[PDB]
């Protein structure tokens, strides 16, 4: 938590997730409906099994 | 390609002459037909936690 303690925090590896989310949002309904799971969690995992 | 094109000859006595003839070889190119078995297009049922397009 102490930011004075060493930490490395600059590389695109940090940002690929949100960059990809932006890209599929720009793509339209095809990508979003296609990759539904990370946006819409299952109503119940017990049913999902 | 003619086999006996060049022959020994005897000008002193040619005697008889061996007959010759020319032929025509035939090459080939065979046609094969490939394909694909009928592929089912399934509904996206790998959706426990994994995604399915």
Automatic annotation (TrEMBL), chain A:
Q: Which domain of life is it from?
A: Viruses
Tell me the protein's name: Portal protein
From TrEMBL, chain B:
What is the name attached to this protein's record?
Answer: Major capsid protein
Top-rank taxon: Viruses
Q: Show which stretch of the intact protein is covered.
A: 55 to 107 of 321
